[PDB]
Swiss-Prot record:
GO terms for molecular function: glucosaminyl-phosphatidylinositol O-acyltransferase activity. Probable acetyltransferase, which acetylates the inositol ring of phosphatidylinositol during biosynthesis of GPI-anchor. Acetylation during GPI-anchor biosynthesis is not essential for the subsequent mannosylation and is usually removed soon after the attachment of GPIs to proteins. Residues 64, 132-139, 203-213, 261-283, 360-372, 436-439 are lumenal. It is a multi-pass membrane protein. Pfam families: GWT1. Residues 29-42, 86-110, 161-181, 235-239, 305-338, 394-414, 461-469 are cytoplasmic. Its EC number is 2.3.-.-. This is GPI-anchored wall transfer protein 1. Its main location: endoplasmic reticulum. It is an enzyme of class 2 (transferase). Pathway: Glycolipid biosynthesis; glycosylphosphatidylinositol-anchor biosynthesis. Target of the antifungal compound 1-[4-butylbenzyl]isoquinoline that inhibits cell wall localization of GPI-anchored mannoproteins.
Amino acid sequence: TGLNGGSITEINAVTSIALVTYISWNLLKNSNLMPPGISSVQYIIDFALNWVALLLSITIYASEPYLLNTLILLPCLLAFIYGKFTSSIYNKKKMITQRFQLEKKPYITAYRGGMLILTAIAILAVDFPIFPRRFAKVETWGTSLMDLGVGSFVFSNGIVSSRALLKNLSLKSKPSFLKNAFNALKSGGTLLFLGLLRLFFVKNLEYQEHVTEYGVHWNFFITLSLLPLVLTFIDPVTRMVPRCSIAIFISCIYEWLLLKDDRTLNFLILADRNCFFSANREGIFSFLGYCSIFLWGQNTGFYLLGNKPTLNNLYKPSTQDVVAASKKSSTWDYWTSVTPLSGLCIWSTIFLVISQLVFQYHPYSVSRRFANLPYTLWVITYNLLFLTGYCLTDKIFGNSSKVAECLESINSNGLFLFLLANVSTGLVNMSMVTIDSSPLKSFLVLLAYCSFIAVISVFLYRKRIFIKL
Ligand SMILES: CCCCCCCCCCCCCCCC(=O)SCCNC(=O)CCNC(=O)[C@H](O)C(C)(C)COP(=O)(O)OP(=O)(O)OC[C@H]1O[C@@H](n2cnc3c(N)ncnc32)[C@H](O)[C@@H]1OP(=O)(O)O
């Protein structure tokens, strides 16, 4: 680390392989040349498309992603054409009779699985000399590949956590104010406990400082735990204003406070670590950006988790039908009641136009350490623009009415496999010296580790075992 990072135009090219391989898998599956029953060929193809391709893209072919993105796509298209040439239900009454329910979407499963796979690879890949130094994290100002996961995980959690509000809306009795706090504590208990355990153990660890990231005591597992508890209190205010109008206000207030004078920056950068507040400045101050990211994720998760469009679902959680509203509908309810793709396109366009003008006037640059406005804009725009393609692929190929096994397996056992991967890298880091390894040895070690994780994950999934911590 310690070097200025790369650019966005390289990060996009490096990370597009996750969507390219998904499209290739869909094409190959629809080519109909594969045998119907499960076999070794299916597992080999799945493992080569999911795990190995990302490993090659991150490490060896990092200097030529455009050449890698075609050798996977073209043969599958040729096979699809060959199969198509060689080869010899939706009802409106159902939609009328259907009520409002939650549904499990496949592209969300793929989007969650790919991020976990990439995180699991890149956690260990950073300790070897074959991993380019441009992708390592940067201190204060700068952009890199490893500064995006921290925002992406918060965005994904915000997207998912809206189904609780959608479900509780159908309830005929309002839960008490003290009951939601208990629910939030129950949801965040394991993360809070694992975060607190590190404070009691750092003294025994006596590892490197790394204080400048979050502080002496603060941690990411506390930031993830405290968000729902704080956002519980916000609902009475949202009774009067839309949810996004709170994120906008918070972002504007924080940016005005940062750009008003240089005193705040001087305190944040040069102040001595004397008292508790001075020893955890960054962890406390990045909360005002993480809250905005979480709120925007929650707002985005309103029109994706349903099974049919409802009334005013672009900005409000609602279950009212639009069939009765279709009689002499106004010009507002016609535009603010959309299918998932229509909402995603509108929000992507608005955020692109806002960011393209914000980036031309901000004197400073992106900074994860403080989580200022440009970082949030970049994090949100990237995720919206990837979800748009992920959703469009399903509509083009027509499967909205399962996905590769290695994606579902890693999606169904997230936290446990994350901890297992962390322990594995911790073991390899002490079983050998990494910085003095030859490239072939490094590649073999990475391949063996990937195979071990994949085998364990699939074995847990087949036998129907789900571990909740
Ligand atoms: C493509 C890549 C793009 C981004 C590309 C950018 C770069 C990407 C990083 C790369 C650069 C290296 C890496 C940097 C970053 C670090 O180096 S480190 C980052 C730090 N990471 C962490 O701390 C891990 C955080 N983990 C968590 O927040 C969570 O525990 C997990 C593991 C993500 C998910 O946990 P969980 O929510 O308990 O999971 P789970 O119970 O399975 O699901 C929860 C809910 O979702 C529901 N659900 C699940 N699937 C679905 C579905 N398909 N539909 C609907 N609902 C669903 C479940 O039914 C459940 O519903 P409820 O029961 O809540 O009602």
